[PDB]
Amino acid sequence: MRPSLKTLQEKGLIKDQIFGSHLHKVCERENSTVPWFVKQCIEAVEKRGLDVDGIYRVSGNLATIQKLRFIVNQEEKLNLDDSQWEDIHVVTGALKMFFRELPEPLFPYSFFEQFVEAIKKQDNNTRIEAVKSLVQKLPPPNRDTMKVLFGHLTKIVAKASKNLMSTQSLGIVFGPTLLRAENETGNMAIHMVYQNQIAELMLSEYSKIFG
Numbered sequence: 001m002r003p004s005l006k007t008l009q010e011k012g013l014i015k016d017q018i019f020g021s022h023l024h025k026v027c028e029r030e031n032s033t034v035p036w037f038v039k040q041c042i043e044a045v046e047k048r049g050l051d052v053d054g055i056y057r058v059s060g061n062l063a064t065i066q067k068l069r070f071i072v073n074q075e076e077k078l079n080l081d082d083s084q085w086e087d088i089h090v091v092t093g094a095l096k097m098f099f100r101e102l103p104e105p106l107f108p109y110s111f112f113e114q115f116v117e118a119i120k121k122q123d124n125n126t127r128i129e130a131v132k133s134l135v136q137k138l139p140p141p142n143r144d145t146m147k148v149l150f151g152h153l154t155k156i157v158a159k160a161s162k163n164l165m166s167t168q169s170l171g172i173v174f175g176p177t178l179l180r181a182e183n184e185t186g187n188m189a190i191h192m193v194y195q196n197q198i199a200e201l202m203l204s205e206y207s208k209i210f211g
Contacts, residue, residue, distance in 0.1 A: 014074075015075060017074075018075070019097070020103065021102075021103070022104060023035070023141050023145065024141055027141040033140045033143075033144035033145070034145050037095075038095065038098065038148065039148065041080070041091050041098075042148065043080070044088065045095075046155065049092065050155060050156065050159045050162070052089075052163055054163070054164060054165065055156060056092050056153075056165065056173050056174075057165065057169060057172075057173055058089045059093055060087050060088075060089030060091070060093040061089075062093070064085075065090050065097060067084075068091075068094045069094060069097060072094075096177050100180075105178060105180040106142055106149075107142070107178055107180075107198070109184075111137075112179065112184060115134060115198050116194050118130035118133075124205075128205050128208050128209060131198070131202070131205075131209055132209045132210075135209060135210070146178075146202065147210045149178075150206050150210065151206060151210065153174070154203060154206045156170060157170065157203065157204075168200065170199070171199040171200040174203075175192070175195035175196035176192070178195075178199060179199070181194060181195045
């Protein structure tokens with residue numbers, strides 16, 4: 001006679017507090033524009049992940065990621081220096097899982113057509129300006145979380161000699177993770193290029209887009 005997820009949530013045993021909630025609800029609860037969990041993961045990756053081969057491409061142990069997620073959902077105190085989290089790929093995996101589990105992607109669906117128009121622009125400086133305009137129209141949690149995440153990712157790129165990542169391979173990872181445009185009505189191959197190109201531009205032109 002094992003209780004349901006409804007039961008466990010009612011009873012109060014399983015919170016499911018963070019993962020799967022809108023960015024706006026997570027941020028409203030913490031009184032933030034960037035979720036604490038995102039900043040924690042970023043900090044751990046900067047501390048001990050910048051030189052690691054295939055950082056963000058390599059997968060951590062999903063069973064350990066799932067326990068990381070659970071602890072965070074239980075709103076327990078998280079310390080990423082604990083030996084349990086020693087594989088930095090569990091941290092990167094949990095960060096990506098957070099973005100994948102948002103009910104709406106970091107790049108809102110209402111903005112996707114506008115961002116696509118933006119990267120289609122005839123030359124790179126037009127593109128930069130169009131995309132920067134759009135970031136200024138976002139709800140502050142989406143803009144501020146983009147700034148923090150892309151700002152972090154520029155540091156991955158800078159250490160490419162040590163981590164073997166590039167703007168292109170991070171765009172392959174973060175395109176689908178942040179824009180989730182594969183299945184929007186239209187052509188899938190095309191939507192996949194659109195989102196990877198948008199992620200690449202936000203990364204490679206971070207300074208001009210975000211200051």
